[model samples]
Target: NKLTEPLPTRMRILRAARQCFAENGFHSTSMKTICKASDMSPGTLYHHFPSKEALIEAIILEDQERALTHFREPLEGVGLVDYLVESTIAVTREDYAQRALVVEIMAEGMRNPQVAEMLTNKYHTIIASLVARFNDAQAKGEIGADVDKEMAARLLLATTYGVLSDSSSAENARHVSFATTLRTMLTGLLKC
Candidate 1:
């Protein structure tokens, strides 16, 4: 028998699986639920992902890779604070569904140590890189000399992640008004 590819069907299944996982989370989400949502049979879903957990893991890993693309590139030429703020806003606008999926996966990971370890590895690597960037910025006098670069970077990540995770929150209104407020706050805190 000749080998064949079902690219379209596979794409459809992956899209549906991501949507369902984003909406319902891993534990509450089921193969039957994903199958119904995808309009695919169990065999086909299994052909794509051996298990629900595997599917979630794959989605998280894929999203992690995508997220890292932004980080690997330097924000050197531009103003660092503006780069951070604009990137946060751009991400908030562009990838809300994926952002939601990340939050859902975060909740699931918090409950599962193995998954948590996987997630922490990805995030810690990213955070370490960000810390390096902050250290570079401080060395270049782009920010305060006395600033705890790592902590500042972590705060940026935490605050931005919180905004993305709770986009519906009242504080999110502040995010809309953030550019002015954020710059003002950073001005006081930063040497630049």
Candidate 2:
């Protein structure tokens, strides 16, 4: 029988690479550092991930999938604007390092066509999901019927990207504060 079993070693490599990349970025972190951080030999690391680019692509794809889960669920009983604000605050505060790594991945995407395509596809999926949510909110009278769902989705996504791009903790704190004002403005814009 042929079987592919899960391996802790592979997970270790991913964790190590995430930590290294988040702290030092993709360009600054080397294979040697990843090996050391993973507590594995080059042979083992290569056995799991043939190259650094492969490892990074795995990380990016994994994280994007995780983020997509957040979009799949409804906001429960919360108002759409309030949910958006709280969600933005939660992501900015809780996943700051990972968010910074996302920015690094975005920069790499600019020079790497594969990465760019992956990110573009992920963004389109997320934006489409957001548009659907906005449409549902409008149908429910949670937002103005006249609001442009696609434009609103794009604006919200761009704002979230801007907030998540900063690497500084202090800057993130400022973003948390700004999210309040942004929530007010967005609420007003979407008011029925």
Candidate 3:
């Protein structure tokens, strides 16, 4: 069956589940909801993902890797600081794909040790990658050699991720003001 095509089936499943979970909160995201969205039998969906946990795991990893491609790549025309600020804004914006799903997983992580662990490790991985980027920035003389790449990486990621995770913590306003404030402070404190 075309629906049984291995790789495409997996991708299709993920896309539907991702959209469903993004539109509906995790608890509201019934298994039936996902199956309906995928236009597949529940048995077919279960054949691929044994449990909701497994499905969520696949979705989380897939989404992070998708976002990481942006974090991992080089800046074509932008400099380090601007790229950091701009990309953070772009990725965490309200309309960004998986943004709501990300919040869902994060909220789920609060009660699920396995998910929390998975996210924690991914967070560290992202920070490490950002540290590498910061190293490149220093090498290119965009940031001063005296700047602490790991420290900066942690701080910036914390800020960016914090904004995205917020459900109703004056977050949108805080985020709007943060872009200029952060860029100003980073440039004022570090070499640019």
Candidate 4:
């Protein structure tokens, strides 16, 4: 979080809390640590929000805009395929995969069997989810009926990783090319 008058108090607190939670995991994190990180008083911190529980909900909910949806529901506002393009670049768009908060938290989850089990379940959940969206789009004649909805869903997820791993120094332009071409590929592949 940038320390200044630009982002305001609430967001400032959330940014620090999210960074702390992502780095340390919620179980190991404390308000004292977050307060120190934000350079704010303990009283100023709670003055904006009551508890870490409240802050955690806000943190997870915002990440859902980038397609980290377990803590929240699947997106409804964005259309089907367009949502895929956005999710495809979420790792790059938000930040490098390693530094991304959701990715870091997910990485930690892999080491904990309980959380790892949840992630494996979530893995299937997202796959099944887009497959259902494929079904919906095809039924609506929004996309081609001949395309294998399951395979397309998986392929989209697969090639999407092609965009995830950055391509050298020209990272932004390269990613944008991947996204446009990626979007174009699906547009033609799925068009009726």
Candidate 5:
């Protein structure tokens, strides 16, 4: 069956699962709690989702699909430095809750290879797409020819994660202002 089939019911469960998993984590969130949160029975939830792992996968998959869409569109002619900073800040600011959920998944995925593989597969595309943009910048002489584009791409992705992971305790303006500074530092590293 198509993954997108049963849109409404799946959406309700997905939303409930996102909240419950975010707060209580996968190990702590029981089927009964998820059912109560979604206002569905264990039988109904099971019919829709075979297991909690499956539900978590769906949540991560859906969010990554949306994130990749936004991430790829602006890379065409945009400067790599600016895109990294602006996109990181923009995505983090705009989707704070979803981004936070992603952070939670990242931690959980460290313990679950199934979830880790799912995330890594999707994130590889995101890193590759952004790396391609860096390549374009290098071709244009905006970045040094000797720069390691792949490493740069990895750093950008890693730092973005660092920023979000620290956001809860960060001063409001610091989190808001960090993306631009991150871009500036990355660009400075690539100078001839």
Candidate 6:
């Protein structure tokens, strides 16, 4: 089956699975729960997604596509530092439920090889994109020539993940404020 095939039923299955998985841990969630959540018959759900793992993979793939699209927006008139600050703010303000679901998926990834590999590959794709952006910026003298683009990209990923993971903390307001601090740090690094 083509991965890009636009099936409304498949989207429903993914949405239901995300909700189920977020409400209950991945290990605790069941296909029956997903069916109930999606309001689909077992046959219909199974036809669209053979297994829970398949559903999980689809969710990750869809999420990765969204992230790439968000990160790839042109930076033409925006300074990289300003772009990053806005991006960080947008991501931080995203629906808490969705962020929690991502954290749950990440926790599951630690125990599931397939999940782990999928996340690793997706993260690499994101990091590579960031590296390309940084390289381009460096070429344009937007960033320091001496900076290591790959390392910078990895650091961005790590810091963003950390913020998202800790987003539910009582100190999250402070964490949100930290974005400004991070922007200052990035400005220094990029010399922008």
Candidate achieving higher TM-score, 3 or 5: 5
Candidate 6 global Cα RMSD: 3.1
Badly placed stretches (over 4 Å) of model 1 are 1-11, 169-176, 184-192
lDDT of 1 by residue, 1-38 (tens): 12355767766777898898877777888899989998
lDDT of each: 0.73, 0.78, 0.75, 0.63, 0.75, 0.79
What TM-score should be assigned to candidate 1? 0.78
Off by over 4 Å in 6: 1-6, 168-177, 188-192
* TM-score leaderboard ranking: 6, 5, 2, 3, 1, 4
Decide which is better by TM-score, 4 or 6. 6
Give candidate 6's TM-score: 0.88
The top-ranked prediction according to lDDT is: 6
| Cα lDDT of model 5 by residue, 1-192, tens digit | 545658788898999998888777787999899999999999889999989888987887787677677556535666667656666666555555676788888898898898899888777887777766667677777788877767776776777677677665245425645655665688776663
Ranking by lDDT: 6, 2, 3, 5, 1, 4
Tens digits of per-residue lDDT for model 2 on 27-61? Answer: 78999999999988888788889888888878877
Assess the local accuracy of residue 192 in candidate 3 as a C-alpha lDDT between 0 and 100: 66
Q: Which stretches of candidate 5 lie over 4 Å from their true place?
A: 1-5, 74-77, 168-180, 189-192
Worst 10 residues of 6 by lDDT: 167-176
Q: Tens digit of lDDT per residue, candidate 4, span 1-192? A: 556653588888888888787677766888899899889889988877677666655654554334435113444677666766666655564554334555544555557565545545555556677777777777766788678776776677556444554344236534567667767888876764
Q: How accurate is candidate 4 locally (lDDT)?
A: 0.63
| Alpha-carbon RMSD, each predicted model | 4.0, 3.5, 3.7, 7.0, 3.1, 3.1
Question: For candidate 2, what's the RMSD?
Answer: 3.5
Which residue pairs in model 1 clash with each other? Answer: none
Q: Kindly give the stretch of ten consecutive residues in candidate 3 with the minimal lDDT sum.
A: 167-176
lDDT of 3 by residue, 140-174 (tens): 87888777677777777667767776654335545
Model 4 regions lying over 4 Å from their true place: 1-10, 20-30, 40-57, 68-91, 95-99, 113-132, 142-192
lDDT of 2: 0.78
lDDT of candidate 6 over 1-192, digit per residue (tens): 546654766786787788888888789999998899988999888888889888888888877886798566546888777777777766777777788888998999999998999898889888877877887778777888878777778888877777778855435534656677878878776666
Candidate 1 vs candidate 6, TM-score winner: 6
Off by over 4 Å in 2: 1-7, 167-179, 188-192
TM-score of each: 0.78, 0.82, 0.79, 0.51, 0.82, 0.88
